[PDB]
Amino acid sequence: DVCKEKICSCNEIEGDLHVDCEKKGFTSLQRFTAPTSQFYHLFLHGNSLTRLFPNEFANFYNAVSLHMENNGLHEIVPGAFLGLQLVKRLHINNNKIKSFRKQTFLGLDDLEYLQADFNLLRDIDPGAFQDLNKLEVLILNDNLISTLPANVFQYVPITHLDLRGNRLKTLPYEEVLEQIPGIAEILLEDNPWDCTCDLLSLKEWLENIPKNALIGRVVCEAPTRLQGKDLNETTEQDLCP
């Protein structure tokens, strides 16, 4: 019914119309509507949207970017984002979403920007982003990602990959690292990197990578033989004797 229902503050500037519904205490958005002619940036910050069910945001098809952080979100039923072809930017950080499954991001065809930092994320379905073919920037810092599945970034135009602050032991070239040639910024700092035979691929890759594309350091946390040492200056013999 917003905005002529006065519920949220849809002030009309600058150059874009911002629908500020931050801290209004929304629990669902199937009961609500949004303007027909104007495109808008939707802000649903601190509203306590605990669960997203199919065909929420259905009347918000004209949204260009969705920003729903600090909602304590944990459950996303597939098709919750359905209808959001226009959206280019999705903020779902600072919640409690424990995993990415396939068809989790169903509906978001144009999506270019994804932020899911601080979410206790662990498992990520291989075919989670496989339809997000415009996803240039993926930000996943401060989570519990143990591993990245084989084909996760196949045909996903990743350019910014923020993977800091996870439980990430290794990163394979085969399928995973080869499939993202277009990187310009990658962040791997704060990970328990296990420098063994399995990390060689990373090392060599970081050599062939565009210069200054890696942001931060990749320090070996293991083994104790190598703890505290940069991958930068790690002889191949030491990784793989």
């Binding site: 240039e136 920037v137 930000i139 350019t159 310009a184 910024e185 703890q227 505290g228 040492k229």
Partner: protein
């Protein structure tokens, strides 16, 4: 009350097939001038051009992309008009095909890349151009020229002087990143020959990554050793925390590790020809504090 007056007028430009041409025209007056772009009389009307107005309203920019020859050529007119008056300036476009490019035409050796910057930090978009005579660098954000004027501001276009037979730089430095600053940037090299554009580069602005701060802790403490006299021992000292603390080696109050290359996180001490017993003190340092641990070296 007042007539219109040109504050900035478009100048003749030479572009390349499939490239970009931009003409800037802004005026002042009361009531505010209306800017019209005419192509040899009538206003331009096609599916390749685009008029992008200033947020001021002071003027606009004619954006032709991609350049087609000889179709794009040649002359255009900027007309500023209000109730009390009207004024006009003209300018010539030239678009040369791929085999008409001179030696020393502006070329972008390295353009700007995608950039996600945390808010209130520095974001410096890079560019590197080469041409004869040497190209002058200038920037466009979202189809509009970047005001890098001399008057003090965050948005400085760096001299970034690199010497010799190297390319020109001219990087765009953005201090105190804001939500306004994010958008599509484009680098532009311009000399006598003409104008070359770089591929567009998106700038994104995010929030700062909250990092929990921790004082230094010795992950690997300096161990004690007994050695045959004149032997050589290598003691490993490793400390952790956030920010990751420097690791330094001291003998008494004497500093062994040089401040210039003080290692962050890890330091191994190499003791050669030890025929004297001594205690060596490893010291970790960060803005959250300083700690130290002893490694007792005894001689057998």
């Amino acid at each position: 009350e007042t007539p219109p007056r040109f504050t900035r007028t478009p100048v003749d430009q030479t572009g390349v097939s499939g490239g970009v041409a931009s003409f800037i025209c802004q005026a002042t007056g009361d009531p505010r001038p209306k800017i019209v772009w005419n192509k040899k009389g009538k206003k331009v009307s096609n599916q390749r051009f685009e008029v992008i107005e200033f947020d001021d309203g002071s003027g606009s920019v004619l954006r032709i992309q991609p350049l087609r020859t000889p179709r794009d050529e040649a002359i255009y007119e900027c007309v500023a008009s209000n109730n009390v008056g009207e004024i006009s300036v003209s300018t010539r476009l030239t678009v040369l095909r791929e085999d008409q490019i001179p030696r020393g035409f502006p070329t972008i050796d390295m353009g700007p890349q995608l950039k996600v910057v945390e808010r209130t930090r520095t974001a410096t978009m890079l560019c590197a151009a080469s041409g004869n005579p040497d190209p002058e660098i200038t920037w466009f954000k979202d189809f509009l020229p970047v005001d890098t004027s001399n008057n003090n501001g965050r948005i400085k276009q760096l001299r970034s002087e690199s010497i010799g037979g190297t390319p020109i730089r001219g990087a765009l430095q953005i201090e105190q990143s804001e939500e306004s600053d994010q958008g599509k940037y484009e680098c532009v090299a311009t000399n006598s020959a003409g104008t070359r554009y770089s591929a567009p580069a998106n700038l994104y602005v995010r929030e700062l990554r909250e990092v929990r701060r921790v004082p230094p802790r010795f992950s690997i403490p300096p161990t004690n050793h007994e050695i045959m006299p004149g032997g050589s021992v290598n003691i490993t000292c490793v400390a952790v925390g956030s920010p990751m603390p420097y690791v330094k080696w001291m003998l008494g109050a004497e500093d062994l590790t040089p401040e210039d290359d003080m290692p962050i996180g890890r330091n191994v001490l190499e003791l050669n020809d030890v025929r004297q017993s001594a205690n060596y003190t490893c010291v970790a340092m960060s803005t959250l504090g300083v700690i130290e641990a002893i490694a007792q070296i005894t001689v057998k």
